[PDB]
């Protein structure tokens, strides 16, 4: 009645030794955390990295916030850290009246819920976002040229340090050398009483990590991978504004939805409390949302395991359907990792091996395909050193690299050998297709990997 809680989603609490590792870890829980889509991790009681920081020389600018359902708010875009927890203690100390620890979760989770339901009610909230900088940085231990205390250095190297996360060798988006700041660097997050993510998934499907450093907890919902199409047919229906094409990567619309509407259309949703000092990670394609209970701070990264690379290909293609933009270029990152091979770890080699045959095979295809429409003349071609915005495909905005078509009529202009039909109107034999590699470069380039992977 108002608020049925979904079920609880999966906890884990390895020990000293299961933890050692995040990346077998991780793959271990899979099987049952795909499931729901989110999990908790708990670590082991002694691992207690230290966070220390002047509230007073941390400053940031603030994001405002209004609390309704189903509309849509863009999903990116002065306080010091006292003066925020100040504004933030004080509001809901003022909105429930009590003091802020009194305030039970199950009471906040349900008001929250009512009152973005309500439109006589108009509750703004502020929050904090950003990656980290120079005014505020991580609040995990780093280099610095500052001398740092036995406790820190002991932290320097996790594989949990969230700056080390993308850069470890069973990782596969740290070999990207067109890097991409929004994607590989941890993300700071200030939060306040009902300050909120709306629900979305990972740029690329990618994984996801987020550990509460200190304060109030954070209320996650979580869908499986499995069911994210169910949602958004979901979405479509109770708010189609959002699914209007949009023009930026920087434009992107996303909502409020309560998970209750959700189960009674049959999608699976799970919850949890995430408390300081616990890990959320969300898997490929696992939509999510939630709110904050209080002042508190995150901190978040992006990830990519082997697991993953054949989802990142098939959200590729997803995106093209769309016409939506990508971060970054799969089959870039596909042939940096074939060029490097050598220094390759050996089950890394071994997936890598799979796509690239897949890629491979595919791109064969699309090339007899457009021979067969009359394109003829060709060039090499270095799409690695064009800006991205200078080769996007002009129909389906998928990021080039592999190969494209181009013509002396429109200068600078490329389509994805999908849209060889969508550049212009002139007959195909004044049409260049330009292109990375040969078929001839690309055999031994997958050679490699089969050598490393033995
Ligand atoms: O908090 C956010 N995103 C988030 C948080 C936790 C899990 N997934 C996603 C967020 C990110 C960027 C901006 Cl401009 C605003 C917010 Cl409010
Ligand atoms: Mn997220
Ligand atoms: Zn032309
Ligand atoms: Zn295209």
């Known amino acids: 009645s108002m608020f049925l809680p979904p079920p609880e989603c999966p906890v884990f609490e390895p020990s000293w030794e299961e933890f050692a590792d995040p990346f077998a870890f991780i793959h271990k829980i899979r099987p049952i955390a795909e499931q729901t889509g989110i999990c908790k991790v708990r670590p082991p009681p002694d691992w207690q990295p230290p966070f220390a920081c002047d509230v007073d020389k941390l400053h940031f600018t603030p994001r405002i916030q209004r609390l309704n359902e189903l509309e849509a708010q863009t999903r990116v875009k002065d306080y010091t850290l006292r003066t925020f927890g100040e504004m933030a203690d004080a509001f809901k100390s003022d909105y429930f ?10 009471l906040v989770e349900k008001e929250f819920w009512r009152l973005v339901s309500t439109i006589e009610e108009d509750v703004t909230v502020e929050y904090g976002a950003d990656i980290a900088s120079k005014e505020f ?17 002991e932290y320097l190297d996790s594989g949990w340090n969230l700056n080390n996360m993308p850069v470890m060798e069973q990782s596969v988006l740290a070999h990207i050398t067109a890097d991409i700041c929004g994607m590989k660097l941890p993300w700071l997050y200030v939060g306040m009483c009902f300050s909120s993510f709306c629900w979305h998934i ?6 996801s990590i987020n550990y509460l450093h200190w304060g109030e907890p954070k209320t996650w919902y979580g869908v499986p991978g499995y069911a994210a199409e169910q949602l958004e047919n979901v979405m479509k ?14 434009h992107q619309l996303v909502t409020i939805m309560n998970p209750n509407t959700l189960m009674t259309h049959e999608v699976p949703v799970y919850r949890t409390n995430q408390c300081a000092g616990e890990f959320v990670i969300t898997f490929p394609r696992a939509y999510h949302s939630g ?15 082997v697991d993953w690379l054949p989802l990142g290909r098939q959200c590729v293609e997803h995106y093209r359907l769309l ?53 003829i003349d060709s060039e090499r071609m270095d799409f690695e050193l064009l800006p ?21 009529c429109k200068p600078g202009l ?15 034999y004044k049409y260049k297709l330009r292109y990375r590699y040969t078929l001839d470069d690309l055999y031994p380039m997958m050679n490699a990997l089969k050598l490393r992977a033995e």
């Open 237 to 250: 229906k109770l708010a189609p504004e959002l699914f209007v094409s949009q023009p930026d990567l920087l």
């Open 202 to 207: 990972e740029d690329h499907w990618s994984y």
């Open 388 to 408: 991205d915005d200078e080769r996007q495909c002009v129909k389906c905005k998928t990021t080039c690299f592999m190969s494209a078509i181009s013509c002396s």
């Open 97 to 106: 009246n009590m003091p802020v620890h009194m305030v039970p979760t199950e």
């Open 291 to 305: 709110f904050n209970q209080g002042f508190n701070f995150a901190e978040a990264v992006n990830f990519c395991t």
């Open 323 to 375: 016409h939506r933009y990508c971060v970054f270029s799969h089959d870039e990152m596909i042939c940096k990792m074939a060029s490097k091979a050598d220094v390759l770890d050996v089950v890394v080699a071994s997936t890598v091996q799979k796509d690239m045959a897949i890629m491979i095979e595919d791109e064969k295809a699309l090339r007899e395909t457009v021979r067969k429409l009359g394109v």
């Open 414 to 428: 490329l389509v994805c050998l999908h849209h060889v039909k969508e550049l212009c109107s002139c007959p195909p």
């Open 137 to 153: 940085g991580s609040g995990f231990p780093v280099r610095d040229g500052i001398k740092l205390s036995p406790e820190e250095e």
